[PDB]
Amino acid sequence: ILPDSVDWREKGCVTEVKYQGSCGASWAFSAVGALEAQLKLKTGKLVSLSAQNLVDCSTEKYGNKGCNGGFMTTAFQYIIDNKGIDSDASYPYKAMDQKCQYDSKYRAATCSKYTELPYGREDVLKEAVANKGPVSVGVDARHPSFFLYRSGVYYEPSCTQNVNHGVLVVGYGDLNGKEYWLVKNSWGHNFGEEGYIRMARNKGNHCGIASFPSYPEILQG
Ligand SMILES: CC1CCN(CCSc2cc(-c3nn(C[C@@H](O)CN4CCC(N5C[C@@H](O)CC5=O)CC4)c4c3CN(S(C)(=O)=O)CC4)ccc2C(F)(F)F)CC1
Numbered sequence: 001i002l003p004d005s006v007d008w009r010e011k012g013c014v015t016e017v018k019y020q021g022s023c024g025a026s027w028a029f030s031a032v033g034a035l036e037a038q039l040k041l042k043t044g045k046l047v048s049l050s051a052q053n054l055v056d057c058s059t060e061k062y063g064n065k066g067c068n069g070g071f072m073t074t075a076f077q078y079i080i081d082n083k084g085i086d087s088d089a090s091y092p093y094k095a096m097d098q099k100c101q102y103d104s105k106y107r108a109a110t111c112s113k114y115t116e117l118p119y120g121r122e123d124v125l126k127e128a129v130a131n132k133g134p135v136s137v138g139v140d141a142r143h144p145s146f147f148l149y150r151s152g153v154y155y156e157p158s159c160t161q162n163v164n165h166g167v168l169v170v171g172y173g174d175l176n177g178k179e180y181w182l183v184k185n186s187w188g189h190n191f192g193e194e195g196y197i198r199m200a201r202n203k204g205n206h207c208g209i210a211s212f213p214s215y216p217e218i219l220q221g
Pocket of ligand 1: 030063065068069071074139161164165166167211212
């Protein structure tokens with residue numbers, strides 16, 4: 001039996017909501033967000049990791065195209081191969097494609113492995129969120145209702161299970177008769193509920209939230 005609700009923000013495992021701007025780097029924000037939580041769990045320190053590092057460096061070898069899109073999974077593989085990722089403070093976000101400027105002197109996290117969860121399995125996603133930490137996911141955000149969301153549990157009748165926007169599932173719950181996923185977006189603090197959107201849970205993989213989940217890990221040693 002899993003907890004009825006979880007919110008990794010209450011464990012100090014989630015950094016401030018970021019603002020991707022006109023650069024399509026939600027995949028990089030989803031990836032660093034998941035890794036930030038594992039880093040806090042392991043070292044006790046909460047530090048924003050560099051999304052810009054992924055945009056500029058996890059490029060064609062990883063099937064990614066910076067501001068024109070990418071994958072959380074191959075962002076993790078880049079961090080594995082690179083043997084690190086810089087802090088966001090040392091390599092801050094510029095919302096544009098740049099030359100890779102990774103500097104091991106400012107390494108703030110490492111990545112040992114990542115795991116992918118089965119398509120559409122909201123039970124498995126719930127278990128991972130409860131027992132592993134925030135989970136990187138894609139959602140179908142191509143709906144004016146998504147851009148216009150202010151509060152409550154988001155439900156979009158025309159949503160599909162094809163994903164196009166990377167976000168971070170930092171929890172779940174059940175409020176006002178509606179089960180939801182607690183989702184950290186990267187459109188700044190003025191989007192939704194202080195930068196978060198609660199999305200309908202157990203409604204047949206609504207907006208593809210469980211289509212392509214993955215989470216990274218940092219192992220001892
Ligand atoms: C320029 C492109 C523009 C679009 N972006 C993503 C679109 S957004 C997006 C898409 C996905 C995503 N992952 N996968 C699984 C697989 O395809 C991933 N790949 C497996 C093999 C891997 N590897 C390992 C290497 O060794 C070789 C290789 O190929 C590489 C990864 C799919 C999708 C989209 N779906 S769909 C239309 O929903 O059905 C098709 C299948 C996930 C998150 C996002 C998120 F929104 F969160 F960002 C990608 C770059």
